[PDB]
Amino acid sequence: NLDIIGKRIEKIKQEHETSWHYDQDHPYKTWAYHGSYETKQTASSMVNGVVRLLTKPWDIIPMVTQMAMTKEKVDTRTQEPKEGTKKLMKITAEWLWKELGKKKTPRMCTREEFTRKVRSNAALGAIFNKWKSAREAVEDSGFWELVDKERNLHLEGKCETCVYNMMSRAIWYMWLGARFLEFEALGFLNEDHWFSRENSLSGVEGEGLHKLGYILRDVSKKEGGAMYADDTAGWDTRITLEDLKNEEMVTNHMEGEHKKLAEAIFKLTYQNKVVRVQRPTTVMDIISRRDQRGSGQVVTYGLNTFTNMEAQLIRQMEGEGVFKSIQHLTVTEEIAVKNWLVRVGRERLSRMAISGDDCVVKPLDDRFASALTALNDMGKVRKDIQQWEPSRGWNDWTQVPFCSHHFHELIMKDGRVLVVPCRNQDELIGRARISQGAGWSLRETACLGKSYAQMWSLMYFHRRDLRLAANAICSAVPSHWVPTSRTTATHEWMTTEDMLTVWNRVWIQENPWMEDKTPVESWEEIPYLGKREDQWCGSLIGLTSRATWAKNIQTAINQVRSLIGNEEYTDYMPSMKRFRR
Ligand SMILES: CC(=O)NCC1(O)CCCC1
Ligand SMILES: [Zn+2]
Ligand SMILES: [Zn+2]
Numbered sequence: 001n002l003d004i005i006g007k008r009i010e011k012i013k014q015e016h017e018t019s020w021h022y023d024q025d026h027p028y029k030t031w032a033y034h035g036s037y038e039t040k041q042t043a044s045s046m047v048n049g050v051v052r053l054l055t056k057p058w059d060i061i062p063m064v065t066q067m068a069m070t071k072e073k074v075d076t077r078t079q080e081p082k083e084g085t086k087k088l089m090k091i092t093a094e095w096l097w098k099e100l101g102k103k104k105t106p107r108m109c110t111r112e113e114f115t116r117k118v119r120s121n122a123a124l125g126a127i128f129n130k131w132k133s134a135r136e137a138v139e140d141s142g143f144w145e146l147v148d149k150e151r152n153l154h155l156e157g158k159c160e161t162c163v164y165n166m167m168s169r170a171i172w173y174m175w176l177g178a179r180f181l182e183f184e185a186l187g188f189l190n191e192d193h194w195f196s197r198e199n200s201l202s203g204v205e206g207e208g209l210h211k212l213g214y215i216l217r218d219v220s221k222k223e224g225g226a227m228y229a230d231d232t233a234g235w236d237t238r239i240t241l242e243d244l245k246n247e248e249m250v251t252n253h254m255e256g257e258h259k260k261l262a263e264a265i266f267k268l269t270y271q272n273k274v275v276r277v278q279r280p281t282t283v284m285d286i287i288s289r290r291d292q293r294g295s296g297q298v299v300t301y302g303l304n305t306f307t308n309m310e311a312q313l314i315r316q317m318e319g320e321g322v323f324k325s326i327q328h329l330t331v332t333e334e335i336a337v338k339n340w341l342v343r344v345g346r347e348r349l350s351r352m353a354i355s356g357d358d359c360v361v362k363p364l365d366d367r368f369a370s371a372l373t374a375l376n377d378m379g380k381v382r383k384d385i386q387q388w389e390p391s392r393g394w395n396d397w398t399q400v401p402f403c404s405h406h407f408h409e410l411i412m413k414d415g416r417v418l419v420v421p422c423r424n425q426d427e428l429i430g431r432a433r434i435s436q437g438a439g440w441s442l443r444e445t446a447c448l449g450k451s452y453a454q455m456w457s458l459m460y461f462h463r464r465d466l467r468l469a470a471n472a473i474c475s476a477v478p479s480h481w482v483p484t485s486r487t488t489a490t491h492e493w494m495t496t497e498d499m500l501t502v503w504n505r506v507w508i509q510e511n512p513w514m515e516d517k518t519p520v521e522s523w524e525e526i527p528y529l530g531k532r533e534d535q536w537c538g539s540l541i542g543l544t545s546r547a548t549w550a551k552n553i554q555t556a557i558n559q560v561r562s563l564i565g566n567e568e569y570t571d572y573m574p575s576m577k578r579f580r581r
Contacts, residue, residue, distance in 0.1 A: 004272045005288050007158055009034050012276070012286060027279075030077045031287035039284045042167070045070070048435040050449035053560050054472045057545040058429045063538075067430030071170055073234045078291070078379035084329040085377045086242055088317070088337065092310045093246035095341045099349075100194055100306075101253040108258045109187030111144065114180050123487035124183070125297055126176040127165055137176050147177045154181065154264035155257070162268065164275040164294055168234050172275065172294045182269070182296050185262040189250075189302035201349035202309045204403075205302070208490035209459050210506055213407030213419035214513045215353055216360060216397045222351055225366035226393020227400045233383040235304065235357035236293040240379050243307050244271050244291070270295060304356040309349065311380050312361050313341075316348050318375075319368035326373050353402060360402050369393060410462055412527055416514060418507060420462045422529075425538035428460060429469075437486055444484060446564060449473050451483035454493035458502060462529045464541050471572040471579075472553050474499075476560035478567040500575075523575045553579075 013020055016037030026033045047068055058064040081089070118124065118134040131137040150161050162181070164172040174182070188194070195203030197215065204212060220227070232238060248266040251259055273294050277285045293300055317323060322340045323333045353360045361368065370390040372382075381387060394400045398407055405421045412418060432452035435445060453473035456466040483494050492506055493499075503526065504519045520526060528534065531541060540546035549556070553573060561569055573579035 001272075001290075004159070004268060005274050007160055008163055008274045009286060009288075011160055012037075012163070016284075023283075023285075025281070026285065028075070028285070028287050030075050031275075031289050034286045034288065036279075036283045036285050039278065040282045041278070043436075045434045045436055046438075046440070048433055048445055048449055048452075049563075050446045050476065050560055051432045051452060051473065053563075054449075054476060054556050055429050055433065055469055056556065057540050057543070057549045058426075058433075060545070061426055061429075063424070063426035064430040064433065067427075068433060073168070073237050074170060074292070076234075076237055078238055078240050081240065081242060081377045081379070082326045082328070084323070084326040084333075085374060087329040087334065088314050088323065088326070088374060089242060089246055089310060089378065091334070091337055092313055092341065093249050093306075095338075095345060096306065096310055096313075097249050097253060099346070100200055101250075104188075104192055104194055104199065106250065106254045106258065106262075107188050107192070108185070108261070109183050109191055111180075113187070113191065114138075114183050117183075118176075121486065121488065123297065124176070124179050125171060125173050126179050127173050134176060143177065147180055150177060150181060151184075151261070154268065155260050157264070157268075159264070159268040162274075164273055166275050166277045171297070174296070178269075179296055181261070182265055182299060185258070185265045186295075186299045186302075190298045195302055195305045200305075200309065201346060202312075202352040202354040203305055204353055204355050205305065206490060208492075209403070209405065209421045210490075210511075212353070212403060212405065213421055214511075216400055216402060216407055217409075217419055219351060219353060219360065219362050220397040222362055224351065224362045224364050225368060226395060227360055227362050227397060228368060228391050228393050229358075229360045229400050229402065230382045230385075230391050232357055232380045235308075235380070236300070238379045238381065239291065239293040239307065241271065241291045243378075246310065247303050247306060301356050305354055308354050308357060308359055309352065311375060311378050312352055312354065312359055313345065313348060314374050314378070315371055316351075316361070316363050316368060318371035318373065319363050319365070321367070326377050355403050358403060360400050366393065408462065408529060408533065410527055410529065413525060414518070416516060418462075418527075419513070420529075421459055422463070422537055425463055425465060427538075428456070428463075428466065432456075442564060443481065446477045446560075447481050447484040448486075450477045450481065451485050451494065453477075454483055454495070454499060455491075457499045458493045458506060461503070461523075461526055463537065463539060464528055464534055465539050465546065467523075467528075468550060468553065468576065471575055472557055475570065475572045476557045476564075477569075478564070479570040480568060524577050550578075 013035065019037035020035055022035050045068065115138050118138055124134070126134060137143045153160055161175065162178045164174060166172055193199060193206055195205035197203055197207055204215060207215060244266065251262045251266065254262050271290060273289055275287055277287060279285050295303060317337060317340060322336055323329060351362045372388060376387055382391065398409060405423050408420050408422055410418045410420050435448055450473060453470040456470040460466040480496065482496055485494065492502055495502060500523060508514055508517055508519060529537070534541055
């Protein structure tokens with residue numbers, strides 16, 4: 001408690017020693033409240049005019065238009081689990097780290113790795129303040145003094161400047177220096193692909209939307225019961241102290257300066273948070289707590305994946321009756337769990353596809369559906385079902401939801417079999433029509449649109465409206481202008497190369513589920529979903545407004561060409577059969 005956080009709080013108390021007050025109408029019961037000073041400020045989503053002008057039929061679809069417009073679960077507290085649960089979680093975490101580290105070496109990430117990261121404009125979610133942008137503070141050795149200072153503080157076992165700014169979400173920013181030190185200690189989890197499928201068997205980190213469908217299908221091929229895919233209710237707010245402690249056991253695989261630094265992040269930022277919060281009543285409240293998730297977007301992913309793999313293995317143990325009760329674990333129930341992990345624990349990881357808080361499990365049989373005592377006690381309460389009502393399974397990998405997607409089996413006119421990702425096309429068009437940020441040029445706007453268009457052509461080519469609208473946007477943006485993206489899966493659509501050539505690389509060449517690597521010569525070799533499948537997943541094919549739009553597409557393309565100016569443009573519409581004269 002208050003020794004570990006006191007320093008961070010005293011430094012802020014003094015930064016605003018003109019303001020300090022212990023207010024009596026503070027709405028925090030779960031969050032420890034320490035005081036407040038004075039402030040006054042707020043990020044609304046803007047519309048991409050290039051994408052909107054080339055998707056006109058969707059101007060009257062509320063599912064699309066509504067997306068463009070527009071904290072009582074973060075004030076909850078999960079009961080510390082039963083003892084038998086704590087034992088199960090501790091034993092499984094131990095085994096899992098060993099498994100994940102069998103062919104990886106934990107290592108410190110570098111200034112030079114973090115420097116290049118912010119320059120190529122990755123999202124690390126920091127605050128703007130001594131410097132301007134993310135890019136400014138990196139080029140300057142007086143910054144890395146402020147970093148150097150903190151780093152030595154962490155080795156000394158204290159912490160001064162590592163404070164969360166708050167603003168089923170609510171993202172926790174940290175000043176860049178704080179994000180560096182996190183990244184230095186734990187960046188290896190992402191950067192060295194600890195949660196690749198090759199390395200973790202359950203994981204899909206860096207597999208890409210074009211491989212996930214194939215991965216669910218290979219899980220389907222295993223003998224067993226239904227595919228379960230239960231979402232947890234507000235998973236970040238359900239991360240117990242015991243989860244943070246079991247996550248910390250990765251430091252047991254570390255050494256030297258690294259081991260101390262990783263230990264510092266876990267003990268001082270994760271297991272003892274300090275957070276500054278705007279309360280429009282506007283002030284800045286300074287609250288603490290020992291539990292819940294609050295890392296950076298990217299480390300959160302890897303740790304969520306870890307704890308999720310752990311819970312689902314344990315839910316599988318309960319379904320297979322490896323243990324009976326969670327109130328306390330016997331010493332034979334210990335050796336039985338242990339014997340299980342050793343004998344079948346790798347086989348059981350390969351029955352799962354886990355991506356942070358999200359999972360699909362094909363358990364050994366359907367007893368799994370009513371194995372709820374361990375899961376509920378770990379605090380990983382399922383969403384939109386009664387706490388003790390059995391999970392409902394899926395009989396068909398092409399119905400399982402995973403990473404906001406479903407997957408179709410699509411058979412090429414030459415018999416080869418693509419497995420393609422999909423979701424409600426209103427979702428895909430509403431997202432493409434949004435440009436997060438202030439002060440975009442017509443050219444930067446146009447280049448974002450082209451990123452979406454190039455993705456549609458790569459991932460969602462089997463949807464008729466998305467192929468046509470992608471050809472239209474790429475016809476309407478200068479052929480040579482480069483795709484952009486302000487918070488960068490595997491993004492092979494981020495290139496100026498011929499898209500049919502990328503398609504052959506991604507779907508034929510680099511695809512391990514394709515045994516015949518015969519290139520595809522033109523876009524008409526590449527099949528669509530069935531017309532009715534396309535309509536089920538939101539297609540406007542058959543509607544009057546869409547038939548007009550398609551017939552008169554070269555007129556919308558020209559409107560955009562005229563707003564941008566006289567530049568060098570390619571016509572891509574002859575790539576489709578109907579427009580090919
Ligand atoms: C949709 C489905 O097949 N099963 C999910 C639940 O288990 C049942 C309702 C919420 C969780
Ligand atoms: Zn610190
Ligand atoms: Zn679909």
